[PDB]
Amino acid sequence: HHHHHHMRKIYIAGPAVFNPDMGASYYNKVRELLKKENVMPLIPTDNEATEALDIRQKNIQMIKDCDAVIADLSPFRGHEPDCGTAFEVGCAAALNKMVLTFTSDRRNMREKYGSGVDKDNLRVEGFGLPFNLMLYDGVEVFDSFESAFKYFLANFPS
Amino acid sequence: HHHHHHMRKIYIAGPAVFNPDMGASYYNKVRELLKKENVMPLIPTDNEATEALDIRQKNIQMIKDCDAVIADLSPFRGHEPDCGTAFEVGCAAALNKMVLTFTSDRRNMREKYGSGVDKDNLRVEGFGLPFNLMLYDGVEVFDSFESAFKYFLANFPS
Ligand SMILES: O=C1Nc2cccc3cccc1c23
Numbered sequence A, B: 001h002h003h004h005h006h007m008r009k010i011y012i013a014g015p016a017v018f019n020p021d022m023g024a025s026y027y028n029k030v031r032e033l034l035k036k037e038n039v040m041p042l043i044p045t046d047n048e049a050t051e052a053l054d055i056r057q058k059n060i061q062m063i064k065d066c067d068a069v070i071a072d073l074s075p076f077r078g079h080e081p082d083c084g085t086a087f088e089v090g091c092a093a094a095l096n097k098m099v100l101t102f103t104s105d106r107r108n109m110r111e112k113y114g115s116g117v118d119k120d121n122l123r124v125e126g127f128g129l130p131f132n133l134m135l136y137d138g139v140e141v142f143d144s145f146e147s148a149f150k151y152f153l154a155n156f157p158s
């Protein structure tokens, strides 16, 4: 009786932090969705430090502490995902964490750029993926945070 | 006598692979520089597979096998570094590898964008760093592959 109970935790990776509201609207939506399932969101801006290295270390620790990352790999400042988010996905991959990704634009990279090269003649990947192939681990690329979260619930039970 | 001798290895992360020559000119320069010091370059396109997941896995393994990563975080398709490279930097950080980064543009992000926000009113980081703060671990940001390599030689001896 009164055994320890693990509360599931998801690291909320993505460029919402750069919204004018520092991601408040996104994180609030995430908080409400996860609350219903007794899942804790690990949010990049929580208890935010002032020094870059401290912010970075705390985020790395959240990834170490999580059961899954849900990463927003939507276009950021062009057709490419946010590099901070990409770093976090790599961290999670190395730590053998469940990584779930979504994007607002699921078109292949070559469809996005409209060619096999960009405007400067740099190669656009041709693997039938919406973004850099390093970011794809075989799990479906979802359309939304919600759809990724449904996969989490089905595949990481309490 | 005849003890095993470790050959130092560096993972060569960066968007050179997207050059029209698939990085040949960049990688050849790297190869020539490293051979002089008996250091082996681990190059993303070496023995390249055909399936995205196989390429990804081989690159992650190269990072697991390396002594350091030297990562080209130069502007790619705008002021942001390449997300594949960022993923690799994250992978290396999680694995406690030495990570050395360089860029052709060392200006602060706010100097690059000319404002604290981009054209779409999205926040530009203000930490006096040239790129997303997740990509900075306290080691100096170098100006070139060569200067990063000099740090490697001074800080990872045979
Ligand atoms: O790159 C970032 N990772 C982060 C985690 C938490 C907060 C903030 C704020 C600005 C920029 C970044 C950031």
Ligand SMILES: O=C1Nc2cccc3cccc1c23
Binding pocket: A125, A132, A133, A134, B017, B044, B045, B048, B055, B059, B084
């Ligand atoms: O995103 C990539 N990581 C890679 C590692 C090695 C080769 C190639 C080729 C195209 C695209 C990518 C790539």
